[PDB]
Amino acid sequence: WDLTAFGLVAEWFLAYILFTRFFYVLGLAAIMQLFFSYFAVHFISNSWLMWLIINLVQMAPISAMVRMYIFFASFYYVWKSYVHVVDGCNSSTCMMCYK
Amino acid sequence: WDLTAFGLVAEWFLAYILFTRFFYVLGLAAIMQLFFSYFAVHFISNSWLM
């Protein structure tokens, strides 16, 4: 048996659980990669600068980039929790209004 | 045998006396330990959370 797809789905689910402001740019990169891989060819002609951009977008390892985002967000969340517990916040714009 | 098995059952029963919100974590861990003993050893490489 094989379960790579389930592992990727679990990684995406855990990324969605650890929501931050920078998840949208990763989702945009993923959807752009899917769109470029799905049609391609049609609207790429001349403009070597455009060709370089298209190749860079297509060759980006989206499937191996979510995991780095996980560790990037984990430390930020730990720091925010430490500030909330030990030090407190004065700004009312924080989303701590739940408690 | 009695002394080699009844002790574990007694410990499990005593564990319910000192109930806490984390008891379900141990309950799930016990299921996981037995599940990947008569199964698993498969599903090949790739991914890291699993």
Add this chain to the structure above:
Amino acid sequence: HVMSKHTDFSSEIIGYKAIDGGVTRDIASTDTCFANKHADFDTWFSQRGGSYTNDKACPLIAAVITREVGFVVPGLPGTILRTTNGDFLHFLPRVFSAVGNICYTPSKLIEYTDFATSACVLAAECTIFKDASGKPVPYCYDTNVLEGSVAYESLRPDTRYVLMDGSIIQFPNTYLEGSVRVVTTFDSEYCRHGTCERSEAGVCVSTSGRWVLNNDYYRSLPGVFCGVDAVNLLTNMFTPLIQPIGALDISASIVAGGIVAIVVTCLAYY
């Protein structure tokens, strides 16, 4: 009918062999039931401390003999002799003393210790096949044994062959036979005597004469190397020398690695 014990040709027998599942195999003391036609087998087993119960649903006993006895029947190992009382007997004739159990490859004859892990393709001297029109045509190794037979060497690899009983034979092309073997495969299932297996196209190299096919099951077995191409084979075989032997590479050490960076970054500023 009830099996009976006979003592004819007893002085010509050196030992005994067992036939299980249509393929001859060695005998072990732990086995409990056999089909026997010889009385000296009782002394053979008793000297080794064995006992058994006679039944027809248990492997048969055949005796190795130094004399050409009986005649060859296609599909049956060894030779078959019928006694004056009508009972049939089985023997294993040989040309040279250094003979155990011999199985037939499409080109040569190679001895084996276990049929499951050997290059064996057929275990019979002569075999019969269904032709294009649906009629039996006999094949044999030595044409002098039976008139009208075709040599086994005329067979070709990667060609489907069907026996009289519906079994399928498919053996891959080879370039070297012996202690070390090299094989080539295609994207089609290959089948041997009683076992059909699925394999992918590629090239495999083995340090032993064991059966080799291109799949994960054989790839996990030791002493087997495979690759998608000749160049890729070298990379595959040299990969383990610089790679761990398992999935022990847990990437959870990065938090500890970055702890030092955070500590030094804070310490420099302070």
Add this chain to the structure above:
Amino acid sequence: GGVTRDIASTDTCFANKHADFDTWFSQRGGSYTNDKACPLIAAVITREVG
């Protein structure tokens, strides 16, 4: 389509007439299903025949 062309292992159906083609095509790793609607087969022979 009235035009002779080379053969490749990718094709999957032919109208077989010659018996030895079944052995020749197997050596290239191909498998096929016999259907008369698929392109026919021909053999190259040095001897003047037909």
Add this chain to the structure above:
Amino acid sequence: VLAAECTIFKDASGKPVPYCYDTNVLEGSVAYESLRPDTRYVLMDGSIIQ
């Protein structure tokens, strides 16, 4: 492997048969050296040695 210099074993029919390292110390016994390897043997109490 062997517990003592002299031992006792059951035959194929179950009758007791004495065994020892040397036959000279017990008349009618059979030496250990005659025992073949990879063979099951049984004692009075049913212990199995191979």
Add this chain to the structure above:
Amino acid sequence: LPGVFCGVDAVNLLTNMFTPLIQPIGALDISASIVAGGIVAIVVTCLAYY
């Protein structure tokens, strides 16, 4: 256990004798010194001379 070697066959056992050498560091405690030296000497010679 230390001092015990095993393998499927004579060649397989000889090849598997070097299995701990490709194991990640942290497998030997006392005999690590000789294993390290057996690699250090080969490396230093094969590099610095040849």
Add this chain to the structure above:
Amino acid sequence: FMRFRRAFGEYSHVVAFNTLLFLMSFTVLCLTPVYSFLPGVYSVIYLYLTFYLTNDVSFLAHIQWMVMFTPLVPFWITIAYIICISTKHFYWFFSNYLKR
């Protein structure tokens, strides 16, 4: 970059390379689960490249490499790294306390 150089005093040079090497190692670790070739060849490249650095950042680079890449690298690579690092001191020790 001018604002960054305004702070951290003299140690900005040490901090910059230490952060860059950590980021590169983190990227390599992130690419590890699919590309199994990286742990060996990248370690060899890192060992080759670490020569072209100042000792002040070289010590930090060696410490970071030994902390991070150790549990997922073959033993012989580590012993070769140790020998190559310690030869420069073995020569001095042999010359000053053992040689004739």
